[PDB]
Amino acid sequence: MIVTTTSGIQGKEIIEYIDIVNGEAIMGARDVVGGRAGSYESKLKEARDIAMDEMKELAKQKGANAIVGVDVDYEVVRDGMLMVAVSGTAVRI
Amino acid sequence: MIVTTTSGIQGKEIIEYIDIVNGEAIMGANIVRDLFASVRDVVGGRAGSYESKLKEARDIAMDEMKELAKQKGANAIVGVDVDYEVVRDGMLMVAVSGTAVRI
Amino acid sequence: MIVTTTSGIQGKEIIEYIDIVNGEAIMGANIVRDLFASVGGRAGSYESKLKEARDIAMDEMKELAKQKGANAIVGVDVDYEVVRDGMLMVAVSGTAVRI
Amino acid sequence: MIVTTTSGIQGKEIIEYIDIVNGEAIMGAESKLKEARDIAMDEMKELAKQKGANAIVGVDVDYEVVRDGMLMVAVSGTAVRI
Amino acid sequence: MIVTTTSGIQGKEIIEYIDIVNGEAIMGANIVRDLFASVRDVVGGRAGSYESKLKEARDIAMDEMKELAKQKGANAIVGVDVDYEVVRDGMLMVAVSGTAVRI
């Protein structure tokens, strides 16, 4: 199933814009370092995937086979906690 | 009513761009532990987790946006964006914006 | 005059991109408990004041757009950020165009 | 040089997408906010021009309080040829 | 590789949408402090330096996103967004996202 940060699936007609769906993960409460320095996946991959799984599960719940126009937001939330929040429009194609 | 975070509705022409519409809601304060107060604080309101309350606040901000759009004679809202910001004393704000359109 | 968050306008040709235009406003301070100071301005809730500031920001942007001889703003975006010790700045951005 | 927040120019095909370009201005220590935004935008345009671009599309502005009293404004965009 | 903040490649149809890809970089507090140059007014990121003081963080974020995309068999990344956020004790994070595609 296609998940894209773009407005449409080039080649495919959208049958229905079903709903806007979201997912969120709250992560735990001269050196510039990459997110994958010293590890195979990025430190935020677990958070990001939890957030995207929730969004995908909801979309699937709503009869979607695709999710377009997705955005990722990051906010430091509670006592230091990182939230990753993902939003997108569930569609039938 | 069609609501999308994309810049258009494939299949339909936009007959008129009516206006830009917004909705916000701030979460309720912490009560104790992972318990958080109702976003909408009058008889009925439900306490719960940070995530269930965040989702509630995002649902009210959304519904406020849709109610304004409908007041303006819109049948669709395109180019919807969500924004999150921690404001006064740790409460989370959810703000939603989009363009109300006739299709 | 058309103002829109979409990247374009349907059915109408842009004959000229003029300039990116912006507006901003900072929310007034907290008075007491849930009451916030106007940005004969009225005190209100956080959300009421927030809406007021966003309205001022949007008007300021349109104002700048019209004076540059535009009749439309496209690709509009709203940004929020807490500023000088607890106080929500709104900032609106857009592309002023001739249609 | 046409600069726009839209993702596209009208009556003008993009023939090269050169790079994403960025500008930033740092303040503190509303009118100075405008100055900052201008410095960020001018810095991004300069880079775009030096890269061989004649337009910048999909422009976005971000605002961040890096410390306290310091506000950063960052603009990002795609440098293109039309 | 074409990297673009736009939602498509004018002139080129997208034949496959592979994955959303992300890259990030994190700046130490010690370093963020060495960009409080604003001891006077407003200064550009390129005042007194060749490349912007944040360019290295962005380039590391962008490199990781691209390396990932490339490994997934993509030859372009579209709908790119850059995000900034202050986390833990004053470190600055720059995060980038986009859709890895095949054209």
Question: Helix, strand or coil for residue A83?
Answer: strand
Q: How far is D6 from chain C (nearest CA, A)?
A: 4
CATH level 3 topology of D1-82: Translation Initiation Factor IF3 (3.30.110)
8 A C-beta contact, residue D35 and residue E42: yes
Torsions phi, psi of D34, nearest 5? -60, -45
Phi, psi of B66, rounded to the nearest 5 degrees: -60, -35
CA distance D30 to D33: 5
CA angle C80, B69, C87 (to 5 degrees): 20
Q: Where are the domains of chain E?
A: 1-103
Which residues, at least 6 apart from C88, have a Cβ–Cβ distance to it below 8 Å? B85, B87, B93, C26, C27, C50, C53, C80, C81, C82
Q: How far is B90 from chain A (nearest CA, A)?
A: 7
Burial level of B74, CB count in 10 A (0-12/13-18/19+)?
buried
Minimum CA–CA partner of C20 in chain D: D4
Helix (H, G, I), strand (E, B) or coil at B82: strand
- CA-based end-to-end distance of chain B: 10
Residue type, D70: M
3-class secondary structure, E86: strand
Q: Residue B70 in contact with residue B1, Cβ under 8 Å?
A: yes
Instruction: Please tell me which of the candidates C47, C54, C86 has its beta carbon nearest to residue B88.
Output: C86
Q: Which long-range contacts does A8-11 make (Cβ < 8 Å, 24+ apart)?
A: A8/A68, A8/B6, A8/B8, A8/B10, A8/E7, A9/A66, A9/A68, A9/A93, A9/E17, A10/E8, A10/E13, A10/E14, A11/E13, A11/E14, A11/E15
In chain A, residues with a C-beta closer than 8 Å to the C-beta of E30 are 30-31
Q: In chain B, which residues have their Cβ closer than 8 Å to the Cβ of C58?
A: 20
What amino acid is encoded at E50 in this protein? Answer: Y
Rounded distance between C-alpha atoms, residue B38 and residue B30, angstroms: 10
- CATH code of the domain occupying C1-99: 3.30.110.70
Residue A86 tokens read as 């993902």
Q: Which residues, including other chains, have CB under 8 Å from residue D7's CB and lie 6 or more apart? A: B7, C7, C75, D57, D58, E5, E6, E7, E8
Q: Is the distance from CB of A14 to CB of A88 less than 8 angstroms?
A: no
Give SS3 for A77.
coil
> Is B85 close to C86, i.e. CB distance below 8 A?
no
| Residue-level length of chain A | 93
Residue pair A85/A23 in contact by the 8 Å Cβ criterion: yes
Q: Which residue of E has its CA nearest to A76?
A: E87
User: Helix or strand or coil: residue E15?
Assistant: coil
Top CATH class, A1-93: alpha beta
List the beta bridge partners of residue B56.
Answer: none
Q: Do C75 and D5 touch (CB under 8 A)?
A: yes
| CA distance readout (Å), B13 to A16, B97, C9, E10, E94 | 15, 21, 10, 21, 38
Q: Give the CATH H-level superfamily of domain B1-103.
A: Hypothetical protein apc22750. Chain B (3.30.110.70)
Resolution (A): 2.1
**How would you write chain C as a 3-class SS string?**
CEECCCCCCCCCCCCEEEEEEEEEEECCCEEECCEECCCCCCCECHHHHHHHHHHHHHHHHHHHHHHCCCCEEEEEEEEEEECCCCCEEEEEEEEEEEC
Q: What are the angstrom distances between the C-alpha of E27 and each of A42, A68, D21, D73, E31?
A: 15, 31, 20, 17, 7
> Closest approach of chain C CAs to the CA of D21, in angstroms?
16
Chain B residues bordering chain C (beta-carbon distance below 8 Å) = 7-8, 13-14, 17, 19-20, 22, 24-26, 78-81, 83, 85-89, 93, 95, 97-99
Strand order from edge to edge, sheet including C16-26: C2-3, C72-82, C88-98, C16-26
Chain C contact set for B7 (CB, 8 A): 6-8
Give C35's strand partners: C32
The tokens for D25 are 């201005």
- Tell me which method was used to determine the 3D structure: X-ray
On whether the CB atoms of residues C94 and D5 are closer than 8 A, the answer is: yes
Torsion angle of C-alpha atoms A63, A75, C95, D11, degrees rounded to 10: -50
> Distance between CA B49 and CA B51 in Å, rounded?
5
Q: How far is E64 from chain D (nearest CA, A)?
A: 15
Q: Which residues of B touch C30 (CB under 8 A)?
A: 88
* Radius of gyration (C-alpha) of chain D in whole angstroms: 14
The Cα–Cα gap between A88 and A78 comes to 24
